[PDB]
RNA sequence: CCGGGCCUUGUACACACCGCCCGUCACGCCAUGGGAGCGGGCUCUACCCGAAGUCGCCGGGAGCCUACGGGCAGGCGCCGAGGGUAGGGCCCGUGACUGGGGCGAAGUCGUAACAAGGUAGCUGUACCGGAAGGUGCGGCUGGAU
RNA sequence: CGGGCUAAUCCCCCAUGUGGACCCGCCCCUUGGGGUGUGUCCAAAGGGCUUUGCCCGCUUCCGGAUGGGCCCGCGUCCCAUCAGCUAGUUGGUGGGGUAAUGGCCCACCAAGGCGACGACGGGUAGCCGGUCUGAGAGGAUGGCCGGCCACAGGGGCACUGAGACACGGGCCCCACUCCUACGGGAGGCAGCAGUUAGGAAUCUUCCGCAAUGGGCGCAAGCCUGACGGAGCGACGCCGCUUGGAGGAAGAAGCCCUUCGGGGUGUAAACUCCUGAACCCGGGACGAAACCCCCGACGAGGGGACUGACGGUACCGGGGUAAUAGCGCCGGCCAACUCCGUGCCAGCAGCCGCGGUAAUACGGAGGGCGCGAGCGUUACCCGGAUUCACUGGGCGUAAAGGGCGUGUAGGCGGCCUGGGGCGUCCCAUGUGAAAGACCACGGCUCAACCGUGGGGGAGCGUGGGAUACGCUCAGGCUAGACGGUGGGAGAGGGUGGUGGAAUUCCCGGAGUAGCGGUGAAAUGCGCAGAUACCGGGAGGAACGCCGAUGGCGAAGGCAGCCACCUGGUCCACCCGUGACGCUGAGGCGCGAAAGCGUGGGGAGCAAACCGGAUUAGAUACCCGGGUAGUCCACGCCCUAAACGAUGCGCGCUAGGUCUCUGGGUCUCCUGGGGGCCGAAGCUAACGCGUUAAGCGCGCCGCCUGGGGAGUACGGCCGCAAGGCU
């Protein structure tokens, strides 16, 4: 496997469309540190460090919107969108000034930094930048 | 394609193919007629259009379509041309300019005179 | 066999099969290529001669200045723009004739493909043929029933 | 040319050496930096005023200051149809030379240097600030102004010199032209105007040093085609005028009409008012310094001369209704009717207008838009999201390489530590000014110009943080590889081999037709065929099994046997411990046809002959029949080589069928082969755990159709022909 991060993200985005109460991912302090952000902002319900037939994991507990009428009653997504940015094919790096603001302020972009993973706003608050992990809403 | 490839082969800034080569990047080239006559067009039209074949200071020699009605063009007539083809007449890519050189504008013409080198009556 | 009705199917037809369309030969205009060659540009190699000029040796059988263990003139040499001989490389233009191609069209021959287009079609090659094309070997279905 | 004379801030020797140059030694430093000591070398210039002092100069040595030279790092266009280049070529020792490193030059030793990170060759072009376009990233561009570079008719050279290898200096050569008294000489606008030629086209052979700036001089002053202005040109931008107010239910003319009317039209006429230009008077800012007076030639304070533009702008008084032209009117795209015409004469940027009722040509009426402008052509960006980093795509619309193996490269799973390359933050130097951007200020505005303000990317210096990338080291086992035991299979190769049928030969028997078609005919048959029996020879393909099946990366592989060998799957969860994916190049495989050599040759079968159908039938059907289809060794390397779907991994309901495994045997789990379908995608048809769904990595590929997979060049090949 090339990029677990997008894979991680991918796994999520793949279940949120099918409406899974939870889902699993191979573990890594970095993946976790990420996920740490993804409930403190509220896209997820949180994660717990599970463990499959001998191997560590991160069953993420998923959050979705409310049931609806009309013909398509399926609950709107919390994470409307989640796509990788900086990649192995094209590593993407930003200075504090050139840090984007997701969807006019309704979304975020997880950033790896010398001062821990941050959100688009947390960095600007801490006054730094780094490898744009992804943008999500 | 891969970003790598775009790094290796980049993308091709396709250029333009000029449509008036006989000009040599110039807006107007003088010529001297050689075959003053008429030319039928391809379908769906029918007529006898007024063509002018001209040799140029650019060395070339091209058909130039004579606009308007009634002219004064015959062999050895000093002339000037301009860019502009005549869709229906293959073999013609450029225009001639009335009221210039051994070419005179249209007679008893009152409208859009500029495009037909014809000064002002009373 | 003629006309019509409904369902389905295929269709490159919609001016609707009195459709659409392919090829050779005919005529007209343009354009590229091949071609015994000719014409010019650029560039490379080797060799002969070689101006001014710096540089290196000699300055005596021998002129001048002395600043006389020297200086100038003057002589020899290496390099040397370039000129010449010869042979290669590349590109542009031009050329009897020639090969196909494009557009025009209201001609001539036939009617290959589009319907089971009347031999299912296409395809690679190979052969043949006035031409679209036919056929042999194998392959795909983008083949109707 | 020569002979002879003379001055100096010209040239030469000697002396004096603060000082500076060189050698050798030594301290420090660290590349040839500074200090130190002995031997050696070297300076010079006078002129003028009011005269024992001043000013200007002259000599050396240190430093400052500015202007430079050389060197480095990263960045800088198009073609790979340029893939190899290189002998001063790369390095060294030693000398020359320069202000100085250097192969910049010579000699000798060595054999080395550059290149898919695109060397070498070709084409093009002067780069940057900026300029235009652009939402931006980006594209195009480099005139004007500012900086740097390179050239001074085409080439070479050195002298002078602080400095050049010098545009209006010099030496020579070439090309060109001119002068001439015919023996011989000269010249170089790419300086300001100007001529000639070429072109679509680019101006005055004007005024002046008043300003600014420059050289020379103590100063006065001189030179000044730099510079300041005038003129020409609608070339672009800005500003202004061709008038303003009143003015009929509305003159004439002109266009339309359904003949009542409609439109031009507040437009004019005429009334009043205002007053562009043109007349006179006045008339500048720019111009305060150098210099002269006192003082001290200085600080400071007083004194005059000077204006090219120019009698111009500008100020005052007075005062004339005083140019409108162009494009467009079928849709895009704002603006409508009438005649003429009749696929004719014509417009056209695209789709398209016209063939007797044209909103599309021409004219006119009227109308639309700008307005001393209006339009066209040319070229650049835009729209073009149509080379897509932002920001596209490859099942059928153009595009997956025929398939594999593998180099470079790109990319890379969990955990810990060091370093701190990318990466991020702060500080800081540079990032000239002009311009762009905000504020304001002067020409009565604006265009133009001035003042201040406000940033960045990029790289140089120091410090810091460590998430991800990377690197060094230590562990792990979830990817991969492997061990034990098995299983299925037209996987591939060699050698043997088994039966049915077709063809011919031989033998027996037998008679009037067989064969063939939609029907017929050629053809074969009394020289005994067809159908039968028997024996023999030869070649090729393997009936049922067999199938929506299986294997293979692909093409492809099918009677039976054995041998040699590959890939692959399942289980146990034994070992190595990221060893991995991808793969431009390269290499190998590659159905049929085709080629070469030597065999083989029954059936079939291109070309060929014949018989028929047809108007014709160089074809479809029939009778013969050569290569070839078969084997061996070589090539050939293409295709509807298809799933028109590249390979690996991870994530995303299931249902039914089938192949082969494992289990516990109801059923559960692995791997393949089909079918319908969750969500989702998709232009639709369709795909959907064998994706064409959500994703990550890497390769190939597309950029309208035809021309054309053609030409040229290069490679491959015996050729046909293949690749690009
Ligand atoms: Mg991005
Ligand atoms: Mg017509
Ligand atoms: Mg001419
Ligand atoms: Mg004439
Ligand atoms: Mg044009
Ligand atoms: Mg007009
Ligand atoms: Mg019927
Ligand atoms: Mg019915
Ligand atoms: Mg039907
Ligand atoms: Mg018919
Ligand atoms: Mg012809
Ligand atoms: Mg030719
Ligand atoms: Mg020649
Ligand atoms: Mg010789
Ligand atoms: Mg010589
Ligand atoms: Mg000499
Ligand atoms: Mg020579
Ligand atoms: Mg030579
Ligand atoms: Mg010569
Ligand atoms: Mg056919
Ligand atoms: Mg037919
Ligand atoms: Mg047919
Ligand atoms: Mg064929
Ligand atoms: Mg022939
Ligand atoms: Mg045939
Ligand atoms: Mg067949
Ligand atoms: Mg096949
Ligand atoms: Mg197929
Ligand atoms: Mg079909
Ligand atoms: Mg004397
Ligand atoms: Mg001395
Ligand atoms: Mg020098
Ligand atoms: Mg050299
Ligand atoms: Mg040697
Ligand atoms: Mg490189
Ligand atoms: Mg390239
Ligand atoms: Mg340029
Ligand atoms: Mg220009
Ligand atoms: Mg300049
Ligand atoms: Mg030169
Ligand atoms: Mg010169
Ligand atoms: Mg010249
Ligand atoms: Mg010269
Ligand atoms: Mg000179
Ligand atoms: Mg120079
Ligand atoms: Mg000159
Ligand atoms: Mg001149
Ligand atoms: Mg001329
Ligand atoms: Mg001028
Ligand atoms: Mg002056
Ligand atoms: Mg002055
Ligand atoms: Mg004086
Ligand atoms: Mg005087
Ligand atoms: Mg002078
Ligand atoms: Mg100037
Ligand atoms: Mg009025
Ligand atoms: Mg006056
Ligand atoms: Mg003044
Ligand atoms: Mg007045
Ligand atoms: Mg008036
Ligand atoms: Mg217009
Ligand atoms: Mg119009
Ligand atoms: Mg109409
Ligand atoms: Mg418009
Ligand atoms: Mg309209
Ligand atoms: Mg018109
Ligand atoms: Mg159309
Ligand atoms: Mg009409
Ligand atoms: Mg104006
Ligand atoms: Mg364009
Ligand atoms: Mg637009
Ligand atoms: Mg864009
Ligand atoms: Mg697209
Ligand atoms: Mg296609
Ligand atoms: Mg394929
Ligand atoms: Mg590798
Ligand atoms: Mg990693
Ligand atoms: Mg680490
Ligand atoms: Mg670092
Ligand atoms: Mg600036
Ligand atoms: Mg103001
Ligand atoms: Mg400013
Ligand atoms: Mg800005
Ligand atoms: Mg900065
Ligand atoms: Mg730093
Ligand atoms: Mg670390
Ligand atoms: Mg790496
Ligand atoms: Mg390790
Ligand atoms: Mg495993
Ligand atoms: Mg294994
Ligand atoms: Mg036979
Ligand atoms: Mg017998
Ligand atoms: Mg028998
Ligand atoms: Mg069968
Ligand atoms: Mg099968
Ligand atoms: Mg174990
Ligand atoms: Mg171990
Ligand atoms: Mg591989
Ligand atoms: Mg083959
Ligand atoms: Mg074969
Ligand atoms: Mg042969
Ligand atoms: Mg032969
Ligand atoms: Mg043979
Ligand atoms: Mg035979
Ligand atoms: Mg036959
Ligand atoms: Mg015949
Ligand atoms: Mg016949
Ligand atoms: Mg025949
Ligand atoms: Mg036969
Ligand atoms: Mg043969
Ligand atoms: Mg043959
Ligand atoms: Mg063969
Ligand atoms: Mg053969
Ligand atoms: Mg190939
Ligand atoms: Mg198939
Ligand atoms: Mg497959
Ligand atoms: Mg294909
Ligand atoms: Mg793909
Ligand atoms: Mg079983
Ligand atoms: Mg299955
Ligand atoms: Mg389905
Ligand atoms: Mg659905
Ligand atoms: Mg998509
Ligand atoms: Mg599969
Ligand atoms: Mg591939
Ligand atoms: Mg084209
Ligand atoms: Mg094309
Ligand atoms: Mg081909
Ligand atoms: Mg060729
Ligand atoms: Mg070819």
A2 in B contact zone (CB under 8 Å): no
Which parts of A62-119 fold into alpha helices (H)?
none
Q: In this structure, what DSSP letter does residue A11 have?
A: H
Nearest CA in chain B to A87: B3
Q: With a 7 Å cutoff on the CB, does B122 touch strand C?
A: no
Residues 91-110 of B with CB under 7 A from strand D: 95, 108-110
| Of the candidates B121, B48, B52, the residue with the CA atom closest to the CA atom of residue B88 | B48
A29 in B contact zone (CB under 8 Å): no
| Of the candidates B92, B98, B17, B104, the residue with the CA atom closest to the CA atom of residue B49 | B92
For this PDB entry, the determination method is X-ray
What pairs with residue A23 in β-bridges?
A60
- CA B65 to C1' D64, in angstroms, rounded, equals 77
Which parts of A17-129 fold into alpha helices (H)?
29-40, 120-126
B2 in A contact zone (CB under 8 Å): yes
- What residue has token string 């902002």? A41
Q: Residues A123, A129: contact at Cβ < 8 Å?
A: yes
Q: Residues B52, B64: contact at Cβ < 8 Å?
A: yes
C-alpha distance from B2 to closest chain A C-alpha (Å): 8
Question: In units of Å, what resolution does this entry have?
Answer: 3.1
């Amino acid at each position: 496997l090339t990029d677990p991060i997008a894979d991680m993200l991918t796994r999520i985005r793949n279940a949120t469309r099918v409406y899974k109460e939870s889902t699993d991912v191979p573990a890594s302090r970095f993946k976790e540190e990420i996920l740490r952000i993804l409930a403190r902002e509220g896209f997820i319900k949180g994660y717990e460090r599970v463990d499959v037939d001998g191997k560590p994991y991160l069953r993420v507990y998923l959050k979705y919107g409310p049931r609806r009428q009309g013909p398509d009653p399926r609950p709107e997504q919390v994470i409307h969108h989640i796509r990788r940015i900086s990649k192995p094919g094209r590593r993407v790096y930003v200075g504090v000034k050139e840090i984007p603001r997701v969807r006019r302020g309704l979304g975020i972009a997880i950033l790896s930094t010398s001062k821990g993973v941050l959100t688009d706003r947390e960095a600007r608050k801490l006054g730094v930048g780094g490898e744009l992990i992804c943008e999500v809403w | 394609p891969t970003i790598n490839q775009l790094v290796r082969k980049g993308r091709e800034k396709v250029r333009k193919k000029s449509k008036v080569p006989a000009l040599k990047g110039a807006p107007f080239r003088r010529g001297v007629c050689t075959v003053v006559r008429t030319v039928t067009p391809k379908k769906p039209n029918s007529a006898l259009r007024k063509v002018a074949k001209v040799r140029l200071t650019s060395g070339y020699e091209v058909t130039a379509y004579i606009p308007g009605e009634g002219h004064n063009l015959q062999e050895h007539s000093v002339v000037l041309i301009r860019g502009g083809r005549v869709k229906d007449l293959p073999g013609v890519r450029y225009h001639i300019v009335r009221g210039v050189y051994d070419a005179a504008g249209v007679k008893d013409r009152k409208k859009s005179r500029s495009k037909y080198g014809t000064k002002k009556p009373k």
